[PDB]
Enzyme design. Structure first.
Site, PDB file in Angstrom:
ATOM      1  N   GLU A  35      58.173  30.586 -15.092  1.00 10.45           N
ATOM      2  CA  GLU A  35      58.085  30.295 -13.660  1.00 10.45           C
ATOM      3  C   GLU A  35      58.364  31.537 -12.810  1.00 10.45           C
ATOM      4  OE1 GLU A  35      56.916  26.274 -13.696  1.00 10.45           O
ATOM      5  OE2 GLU A  35      57.006  27.701 -12.074  1.00 10.45           O
ATOM      6  N   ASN A  46      51.777  28.081  -2.130  1.00 13.36           N
ATOM      7  CA  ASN A  46      50.769  27.178  -2.676  1.00 13.36           C
ATOM      8  C   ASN A  46      49.663  26.917  -1.662  1.00 13.36           C
ATOM      9  OD1 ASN A  46      52.330  26.670  -5.141  1.00 13.36           O
ATOM     10  ND2 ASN A  46      53.715  25.530  -3.823  1.00 13.36           N
ATOM     11  N   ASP A  48      48.543  24.199  -0.498  1.00 17.33           N
ATOM     12  CA  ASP A  48      48.853  23.187   0.502  1.00 17.33           C
ATOM     13  C   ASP A  48      49.784  23.701   1.588  1.00 17.33           C
ATOM     14  OD1 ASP A  48      51.316  23.288  -0.791  1.00 17.33           O
ATOM     15  OD2 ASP A  48      51.336  21.214  -1.409  1.00 17.33           O
ATOM     16  N   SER A  50      52.907  24.760   1.039  1.00 19.19           N
ATOM     17  CA  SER A  50      54.273  24.760   0.556  1.00 19.19           C
ATOM     18  C   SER A  50      54.542  26.073  -0.194  1.00 19.19           C
ATOM     19  CB  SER A  50      54.534  23.545  -0.338  1.00 19.19           C
ATOM     20  OG  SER A  50      53.778  23.647  -1.533  1.00 19.19           O
ATOM     21  N   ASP A  52      57.126  27.883  -3.392  1.00 14.81           N
ATOM     22  CA  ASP A  52      58.021  27.713  -4.528  1.00 14.81           C
ATOM     23  C   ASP A  52      59.077  28.813  -4.517  1.00 14.81           C
ATOM     24  OD1 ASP A  52      56.405  25.572  -5.449  1.00 14.81           O
ATOM     25  OD2 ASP A  52      55.312  26.831  -6.812  1.00 14.81           O
ATOM     26  N   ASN A  59      59.858  23.583  -5.188  1.00 14.46           N
ATOM     27  CA  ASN A  59      58.820  23.507  -4.168  1.00 14.46           C
ATOM     28  C   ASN A  59      59.343  22.909  -2.862  1.00 14.46           C
ATOM     29  OD1 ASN A  59      56.564  21.504  -2.966  1.00 14.46           O
ATOM     30  ND2 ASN A  59      55.611  23.380  -3.706  1.00 14.46           N
TER      31      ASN A  59
END
Ligand SMILES: [Cl-]
Ligand code: NA
Length: 129
Positions: A35, A46, A48, A50, A52, A59
């Site tokens: 990750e 991301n 959308d 959002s 991380d 998220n």
């Protein structure tokens, strides 16, 4: 902070993640490797809108508040920036809420695609734990 492999394994063990909800320590170290490459300051945006955050790439759509993810929840009740600290406590405590949520560690795409079903004990081999 960029953790070493065994350094992180020992920090996660101290914070209660070894066998948390049935997931051995190697699963958590493997997830963190893929990750974030063990870097507490990692961020990734991301499609959308959002973002991380941190060593486990939690998220902002559901788990933390970053002030710029409209209509998001803040289920861990923390600012997302708290997830970037060299102290992994906040990340671990939020991760425990995520993994209890229903689909377990499949919530971490990199775990599902790169750790699940592999010999994850290799990630803690050699460490003094
Ligand atoms: Cl599970
Ligand atoms: Na949010």
């Amino acid at each position: 902070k960029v953790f070493g492999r065994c350094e992180l394994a020992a920090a996660m063990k101290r914070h209660g993640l070894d066998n948390y909800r049935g997931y051995s320590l190697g699963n958590w170290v493997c997830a963190a490797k893929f990750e974030s490459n063990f870097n507490t300051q990692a961020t990734n945006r991301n499609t959308d809108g959002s973002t991380d955050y941190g060593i486990l790439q939690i998220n902002s759509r559901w788990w933390c508040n970053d002030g710029r993810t409209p209509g998001s929840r803040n289920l861990c009740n923390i600012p997302c920036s708290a997830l970037l600290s060299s102290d992994i406590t906040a990340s671990v405590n939020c991760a425990k809420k995520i993994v209890s949520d229903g689909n377990g560690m499949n919530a971490w795409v990199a775990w599902r695609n790169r750790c699940k079903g592999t010999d994850v004990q290799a990630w803690i081999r050699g460490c003094r734990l």
